[PDB]
Amino acid sequence: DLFGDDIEEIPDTDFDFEGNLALFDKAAVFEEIDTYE
């Protein structure tokens, strides 16, 4: 959870919004929340 990370180590390329969105299956996660409620 390292909030602070300098521009030197920040990757030169743009953040991969698309690849990271695949790590959160919103509909399945919401169904998991409803199942353990």
Partner: protein, 168 residues
């Protein structure tokens, strides 16, 4: 007219990199960036300045006279970005602001509502971009349900007509 709402999925460790990409790819006129604490507002404003972008910051642990002077300077456009906590009890609506970023996703639906507009007003052009981590899942679910809204995954290209006044 109405605010277009998106979310980007991140870990705490990736938020700054994600924020850097938003600054370089969004046609921001003015922006407001919300955090969940006074300490995080200070840390983030220092970080945005190291990224190379101008910003003012306000939070609850500041002297009244300083907070008011900073807000009035931002409203006058002395800077393009403002980092802050939930200080607007009736909400916020400065005209040049076309982009709101929830660096930290709020806990309450009324807090979320106050960040993306002011009480007793119609909808206006703009974007609301939410940085979501796995720990925000319950709050994301409940705020969408309470408001009766859909916070869509951030697309590959954001149509400029959704947030750029008189352009594309």
């Amino acid at each position: 007219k109405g605010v277009t709402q998106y979310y980007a999925y991140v870990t705490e460790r990736q938020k700054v990199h994600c924020l850097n990409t938003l600054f370089s790819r969004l046609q921001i006129n003015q922006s407001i960036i919300f955090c969940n604490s006074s300490q995080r507002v200070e840390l983030l404003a220092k970080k945005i300045s190291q990224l190379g972008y101008s910003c003012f910051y306000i939070h609850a642990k500041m002297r009244q006279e300083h907070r008011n002077r900073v807000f009035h300077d931002f409203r006058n456009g002395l800077c393009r970005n403002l980092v802050c906590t939930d200080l607007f009890t009736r909400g916020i609506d400065i005209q040049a602001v076309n982009v709101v970023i929830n660096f930290d996703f709020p806990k309450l639906a009324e807090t979320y509502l106050h960040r993306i507009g002011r009480s007793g007003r119609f909808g206006h052009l703009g974007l609301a971009i939410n940085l979501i981590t796995y720990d925000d899942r319950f709050n994301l679910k409940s705020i969408e349900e309470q408001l009766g809204t859909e916070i869509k995954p951030i697309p590959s290209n954001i149509d400029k007509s959704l947030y750029v006044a008189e352009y594309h």
